[PDB]
Design a protein around this ligand. Structure first.
Ligand SMILES: [Mg+2]
Ligand SMILES: [Zn+2]
Ligand SMILES: [Zn+2]
Lengths: 181, 65, 46, 147, 115, 136, 391, 30, 266, 56
DNA sequence: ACTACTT
DNA sequence: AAGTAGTTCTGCCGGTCA
RNA sequence: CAACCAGGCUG
């Protein structure tokens, strides 16, 4: 997101605005205002690694922008928007991730490595890789009888089509010692 | 992928309720949370069942011979 | 299938610099997804 | 396996009558051991469960996305809103005697994957069989009945 | 593959008897009965009841190992009282109590209205 | 074929349940020799105990006028049970708190106890045998 | 196969279902876990060949290992975590059940031992029946901390003639410890008797625990309302304790500690502050956790988890690091591009203030990764590097 | 007020747009 | 009446909330279990496939067919194929159903549990009727099909209990509770601050007197009075799933005497 | 190194392991299918002639 | 890598 | 002193070719 | 009854 302080009516601020957005969900609901439009309208731009070197990013658009004049004891503890030079803002951090990690629920609550594990195993799992398996003659392939979409979810999943082609089941799990088996 | 007959967990029949639930949603315009309560699916073992099924079969049917 | 389509190979030599997760990697490559041992960090995912 | 590098294999299976239960009837489909939580430090598993117990009750696709404004504190409130213990636990009875279990157990759903790798494609044995030609030693490969 | 047949959980196999009673040599006047093709259901109960005959010095039972449908029951009784009998009674009692529970459940039921 | 081995009442100096939902270690002094001290853990569930209390304590090796334990049956049997708390355990050590003040320790399957004084010279045998009893 | 124990001679017991089933206490010597591990079986062929295995390398013998003149197998996991609870003075068992525990022990001389408590209700104590498993002539004396031949804390361990007199039984007593209940039974009664003790102890505790139950869940990872607030400030204060030294060095008012740069010496202080902070932040939560806490109970018996475990879950994760130094400046004079140049504060060199219960921030997360990614790497190095050494 | 700021939730709508056009495998294609 | 008494709280066609009082927990449980596992019932258990073009694979369907509840009122007068003397099976030991479906409809045709068609003589007895509780009365959507998709198979329902496979269980969930106010101390509540506050009270706290401080600990206090609720799937009338439970268990306890007898001959 | 110092051998077997809290320390549960493949050459002796003939 | 022997 | 090749952990389990 | 290359698990 480009944040250029072009706000003659306030501080520095994101190019894109609630209008741009409802104007997009407009087209979402029609299934004219593409991604390419957000781009040509210089609201969002592609910055590589090299060019990243010379800019300053705001994690959350909100949080890291309006001024400051209590805090939730349960939530985590965020640093701050101590800056004004903000040239860009991250669409959402959840995007540093990759398809793999993107299906891991609450990965912001796991010991780092544990995330790299499930990141490899999900590729050892079973489900429904395509809906036309009935017609494919691939050597070896497994389809899970009754796949249930997960109860826990990720806004990322939505684009990975996970809910339409899951890879597991919601099992009623009890954590306890029993027989000892 | 066709509804499961009966709940994995407690065995309580559930193969019928598929269609009912789907209308208590599209037609009766209700929320899942209760559309289920309506179909008698009390505790979660049975709930998680319907609430989660992914009726892929449809996409399947849609092929040919 | 998706994840394989976004896979990166980074040929080796004979260290640990390349195997490690760099800062510039933020936003570009995944911080958690990489093969254990052997070619760890040598194979990355966008 | 769960979605937290929590791999494991079955060790035995029981039917509802032997399985421990909650007065409400519900019984488990899986029983993992408490020990694989402390040292693994995979709280996510723990939360996904509390969140899913809820979402299953309310029928609202629980959100466990990366960095959100959700909290164990919040989730615990919605689950209390439904009558169950605030943290998940429930009282359970030992299916053998029917007597209560002095402890409470972290109950509730959790997405579990069934990955390729089932014993019967592995379990292999051999006492004399095909021998290589150059070497004359046993051949390599379960498929080929090697040793 | 190495799966045992599901019915073996309750069908006595060629040449096996539900009961098999061996006299425990460790202590005096006490025995060990092996119940083939049975489980907790039956066991725990015959153990409980057996735990009332105040002429029964000891009573306990255990399922050898999950894989196998069967359990051993050790019953020790007061002199001159043979445990085989002690088992008999405790058995009957259970039947009698159940029968009652049946008449009674039926009583209440017949006196009801469905909706 | 036996008899008692120690008798006297004490008063609860204090009762303590350090992280023990169902048990408390207690200590009281003798209503006679200001020599006899006492330490005793107690199942304060099957017999509560509140500080400042008149408790008769006893010992001895029997209960009638061991081996396999039998259930009640004793609906009508001898029963040195003339109390409302009777444990059983073993004597592990016979310390010598210097001077002429000897002390013995008894454990009742986990629950411990400590005695003092110096008159159970031919009484407080060092044997395992030892039923403890308390009344009031 | 790293040492003798990775290969042991076992007694076959043909059973059903497709898997090799082995006892748990012999799990550690192979390094075996059940997350899908495979194991090989070799069957002797000669009459003397088998002899070689049965007399020379049967598990019972392999019990007390010369690798470290101490036993190499003990009680673990369930049986361990459970054997502690069965023991606590607090725990008592009633007849109907005690009669089962008794039976379950394959040796039991069919002699119901006198209840410790006769009075109102005849009761038996965990220690009691547990000791029906420990043979006679077995003597053991410990003395942990406030141990006192009357150990109030129920410390150390005093077992006589094979009977538990006082003190809980956990890892240090029934584990593969040097003074081992095991190390003793083995030496004292034979590889044989000991071998069967693992048996009994297990079948007893395992069974008791089947009914007493045990578990764990988020509820056990939450730090008491104030004890947490109290930790948030233990963090904060150290933040300033650092902020200061930071300016104190921006002004050129620091004694380059002998042999180190000003910078070198600077980070050194910084670090020792943040880590020091976290460790207490942890300890704080660790004592604020009552005994009913499951995660603690496991830590007590010593079946799983340790300090830093509790710490990073309930308290503060800690300062992430790479190659020793805290996260570096990959980006010119900064860690991420979400920071301004020349920043040395904790919120930038990789100090994860949040607890795992709370949830790392996008930076906390990515710095944490860079950190993990380091372990995973050398873990794949030390491994092979070791292998060659070993050979 | 087709010119007001934009809070968290909003960003998603943009992300949706992204994939609508580019697609998870874009790179391999282009 | 005489021994362990009952007192049915609510009661329907599918559940039977009720209070089993003055019994032994062991027994309450024994029955509890017997209900879930050893009650006889009928279900499809063999599926001969002549033709299938569905998208669901043979055994996939076959699997389901076993779960489609069937009538089992008179099950107690149908023999176990294994005990009957026929070379395999007869009307004396089994029911035979049919299923033929064709995609005639221009829009997804539906195969339901109702489409089953008994073909064996039901020798005049309530048995083998695809139990329906569906609103439209079609119950259990077996499967769907497109244009010219066909599905012809035959079924053979036999006796059998839950231990052999779940599809024979009639029970399906059973509520079991006792001593709502932890008076026997059979549990130890986990808590952060207050046990009573964090741990919900049960709808059964009512039917039993609250604790009330002062009072010491009732140790001789045993446990009678269990708040059970026996649901059902239909194959058998909720009442039965309790009577037959009560009975089945009775017969087992019986056989043990009978065994002690033949064993007495020598 | 790969043929002489170590080699593939007959009479060996391998599957997935699972702990059992019901076997003595020194035992090892063996799947029937395996017990049935793996064999042991035993010499016919008056001590076992009968036993063996039964097995044969 | 890391170490010997070569270039 | 630059440069080159051996050894770099263990075992199990899809495509071209003389 | 084989090589060669490549890829994937042991968490
Ligand atoms: Mg493993
Ligand atoms: Zn259910
Ligand atoms: Zn027939």
């Amino acid at each position: 997101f480009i944040v250029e302080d072009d706000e003659s009516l306030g501080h520095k601020e994101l190019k894109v605005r609630k209008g741009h957005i409802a104007k997009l969900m407009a087209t979402e609901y029609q299934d004219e205002y593409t991604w390419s439009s957000l781009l040509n309208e210089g609201l969002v731009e592609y910055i590589d690694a090299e060019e990243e070197e010379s800019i300053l990013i705001a994690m959350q658009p909100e949080d890291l922008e309006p001024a400051e004049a209590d805090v939730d004891p349960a939530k985590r503890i965020r640093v701050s928007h101590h800056a004004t030079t903000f040239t860009h803002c991250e669409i959402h951090p959840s995007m540093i991730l990759g398809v793999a990690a993107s299906i891991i629920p609450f990965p912001d609550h796991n010991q780092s490595p544990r995330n790299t594990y499930q990141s490899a195993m999900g590729k050892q799992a079973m489900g429904v890789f395509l809906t036309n398996y009935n017609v494919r003659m691939d050597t070896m392939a497994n389809i899970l009888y009754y796949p249930q979409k997960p109860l826990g979810t990720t806004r990322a999943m939505e684009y990975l089509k996970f809910r339409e082609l899951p890879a597991g089941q919601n099992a009623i799990v009890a954590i306890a010692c029993y027989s000892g088996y | 992928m066709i509804v499961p007959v009966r709940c994995f967990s407690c065995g309580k029949v559930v193969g019928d309720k598929w269609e009912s639930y789907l209308n208590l949603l599209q037609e009766d315009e209700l929320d899942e949370g209760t559309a289920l309560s309506r179909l008698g699916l009390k505790r979660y073992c049975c709930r998680r069942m319907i609430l989660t099924h992914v009726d892929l079969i449809e996409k399947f049917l849609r092929y040919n011979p | 299938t998706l994840s394989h389509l976004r896979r990166t190979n980074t040929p080796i030599g004979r260290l640990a610099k390349p195997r490690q997760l760099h800062n510039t990697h933020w936003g570009l490559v995944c911080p958690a997804e990489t093969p254990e041992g052997q070619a760890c960090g040598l194979v990355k995912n966008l | 396996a769960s979605r937290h590098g929590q791999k494991g294999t079955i060790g035995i299976t029981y039917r509802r009558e032997d399985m421990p239960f909650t007065a409400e009837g519900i019984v488990p489909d899986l029983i993992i051991n408490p020990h694989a939580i402390p040292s693994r430090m995979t709280v996510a598993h723990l939360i996904e469960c509390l969140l899913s117990k809820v979402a299953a009750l309310s029928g609202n696709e629980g959100d466990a996305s990366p960095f959100t404004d959700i909290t164990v504190e919040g989730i615990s409130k919605l689950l209390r809103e439904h009558g169950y213990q605030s943290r998940g636990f429930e009282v359970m009875y030992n299916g053998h005697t029917g007597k209560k279990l002095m402890a409470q157990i972290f109950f509730g759903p959790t997405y579990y994957q069934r990955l390729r790798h089932m014993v019967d494609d592995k379990i292999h044995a051999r006492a004399r069989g095909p021998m290589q030609v150059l070497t004359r030693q046993p051949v390599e490969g379960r498929s080929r009945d090697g040793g | 593959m190495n799966a045992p047949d599901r019915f073996e959980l309750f069908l006595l196999g060629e040449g096996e008897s539900k009961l098999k009673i061996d006299p425990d040599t460790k202590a005096p006047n006490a025995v060990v009965i092996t119940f083939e093709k049975e489980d907790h259901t039956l066991g725990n109960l015959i153990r409980a009841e057996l735990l009332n005959d105040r002429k029964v010095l000891f009573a306990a039972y255990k399922v050898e190992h999950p894989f196998f449908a069967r359990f051993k029951l050790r019953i020790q009784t007061t002199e001159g009282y043979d445990p085989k009998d002690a088992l008999k009674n405790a058995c009957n009692s259970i039947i009698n109590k159940l029968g009652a529970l049946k008449t009674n459940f039926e009583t209440e039921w017949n006196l009801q209205t469905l909706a | 074929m036996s008899n008692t081995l120690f008798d006297d009442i004490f008063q609860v100096s204090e009762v303590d349940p350090g992280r023990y939902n169902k048990v408390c270690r207690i200590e009281a002094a003798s209503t006679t020799q200001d020599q006899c001290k006492l330490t005793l853990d107690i199942n304060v569930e099957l017999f509560p105990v509140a500080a400042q209390d008149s408790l008769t304590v006893t010992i001895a090796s029997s209960l009638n006028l061991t081996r396999s334990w039998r259930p009640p049956q004793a609906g009508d049997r001898s029963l040195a049970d003339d109390y409302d708390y009777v444990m059983y355990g073993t004597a592990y050590k016979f310390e010598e708190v210097s001077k002429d003040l000897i002390a013995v320790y008894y454990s009742f399957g986990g629950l411990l106890m400590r005695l003092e004084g110096n008159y159970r010279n031919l009484n407080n045998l060092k044997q395992e045998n030892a039923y403890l009893l308390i009344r009031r | 196969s790293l040492h003798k124990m990775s290969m042991m001679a076992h007694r076959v017991k043909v059973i059903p279902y497709s898997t090799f089933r082995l006892n748990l206490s012999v799990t550690s010597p192979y390094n075996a876990d059940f997350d899908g591990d495979e194991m090989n079986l070799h069957v002797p062929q000669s009459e003397e060949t088998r002899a070689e295995l049965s007399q020379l390398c049967a598990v019972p013998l392999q019990i007390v290992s010369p690798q470290s003149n101490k036993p190499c197998m003990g009680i673990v996991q369930d049986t361990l975590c459970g054997i502690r609870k069965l023991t606590l003075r607090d725990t008592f068992i009633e007849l109907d059940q005690v009669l089962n525990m008794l039976y379950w022990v394959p040796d039991w001389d069919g002699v119901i031992p006198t209840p410790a408590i006769i009075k109102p209700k005849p009761l038996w104590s965990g220690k009691q029946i547990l000791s029906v498993a420990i043979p006679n002539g077995i003597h053991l004396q410990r003395f942990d901390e406030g141990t006192t031949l009357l150990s109030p804390k129920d410390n150390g361990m005093l077992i006589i003639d094979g009977q538990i007199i006082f003190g809980v039984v956990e890892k240090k007593t029934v584990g593969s410890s040097n003074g081992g209940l095991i190390h003793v039974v083995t030496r004292e009664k034979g590889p044989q008797v000991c071998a069967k003790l693992f048996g009994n102890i297990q079948k007893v505790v395992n069974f008791w625990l089947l009914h007493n139950g045990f578990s764990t869940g988020i509820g056990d990872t939450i730090a008491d309302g104030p004890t947490m607030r109290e930790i948030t400030e233990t963090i904060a204060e150290a933040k300033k304790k650092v902020l200061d030294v930071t300016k104190e060095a921006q002004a050129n008012l620091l004694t380059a500690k002998h042999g180190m740069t000003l910078r070198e010496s600077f980070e050194d202080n910084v670090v020792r502050f943040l880590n020091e902070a976290r460790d207490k932040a942890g300890r704080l939560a660790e004592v604020n956790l009552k005994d009913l806490n499951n995660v603690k109970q496991m830590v007590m018996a010593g079946s799983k988890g340790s300090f830093i475990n509790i710490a990073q879950m309930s308290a503060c994760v800690g300062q992430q690091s790479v190659e020793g130094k805290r996260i570096a400046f990959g980006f010119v004079d900064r860690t991420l591009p979400h920071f301004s140049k020349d920043d040395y504060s904790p919120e930038s060199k990789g100090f994860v203030e949040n607890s795992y219960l709370r949830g790392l921030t996008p930076q906390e997360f990515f710095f944490h990764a860079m950190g993990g990614r380091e372990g995973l790497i050398d873990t794949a190095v030390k491994t092979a590097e070791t292998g060659y050494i070993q050979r | 007020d087709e010119s007001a700021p934009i809070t968290a939730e909003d960003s998603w709508a943009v992300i949706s747009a992204f994939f609508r056009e580019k697609g998870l495998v874009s790179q391999q294609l282009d | 009446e005489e021994g362990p008494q009952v007192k049915i709280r609510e009661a329907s066609k599918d559940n039977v909330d009720f209070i089993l009082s003055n019994v032994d927990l062991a027994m309450a449980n024994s029955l509890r279990r017997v209900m879930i596992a050893e009650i006889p019932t009928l279900a499809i258990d063999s599926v001969e496939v002549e033709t299938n073009t569905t998208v669901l694979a043979d055994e996939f369907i076959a699997h389901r067919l076993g779960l489609i509840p069937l009538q089992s009122m008179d099950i107690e007068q149908l023999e176990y194929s294994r005990d009957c003397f026929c070379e395999d099976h007869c009307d004396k030991c089994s029911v035979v159903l049919t299923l033929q479906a064709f995609g005639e409809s221009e829009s997804t045709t539906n195969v339901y549990s109702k489409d089953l068609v008994i073909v064996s003589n039901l020798m005049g007895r309530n048995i083998g009727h695809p139990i329906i509780q569906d609103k439209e009365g079609n119950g259990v959507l077996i499967c769907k099909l497109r244009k010219g998709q066909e599905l012809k198979l035959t079924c053979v329902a036999k006796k059998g209990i839950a231990k052999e496979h779940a599809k024979w269980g009639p029970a399906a969930a059973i509520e079991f509770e006792y001593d709502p106010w932890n008076k026997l101390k059979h549990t130890d509540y986990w808590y952060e601050q207050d046990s009573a506050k964090e741990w919900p009270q049960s709808k059964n706290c009512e039917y039993e007197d609250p604790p009330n401080e002062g009072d010491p600990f009732d140790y001789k206090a045993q446990a009678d009075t269990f708040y059970m609720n026996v649901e059902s799937v239909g194959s058998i009338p909720v009442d039965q799933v309790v009577v037959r439970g009560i009975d089945t268990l009775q017969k087992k306890v019986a056989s043990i005497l009978l065994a002690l007898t033949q064993m007495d001959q020598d | 190194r790969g043929n002489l110092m170590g080699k593939r051998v007959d009479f060996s077997a391998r599957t997935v392991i699972s702990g059992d809290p019901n076997l003595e320390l020194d035992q090892v549960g063996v799947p029937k299918s395996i017990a049935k493949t793996l064999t042991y050459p035993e010499v016919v002796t008056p001590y076992n002639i009968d036993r063996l003939t039964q097995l044969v």
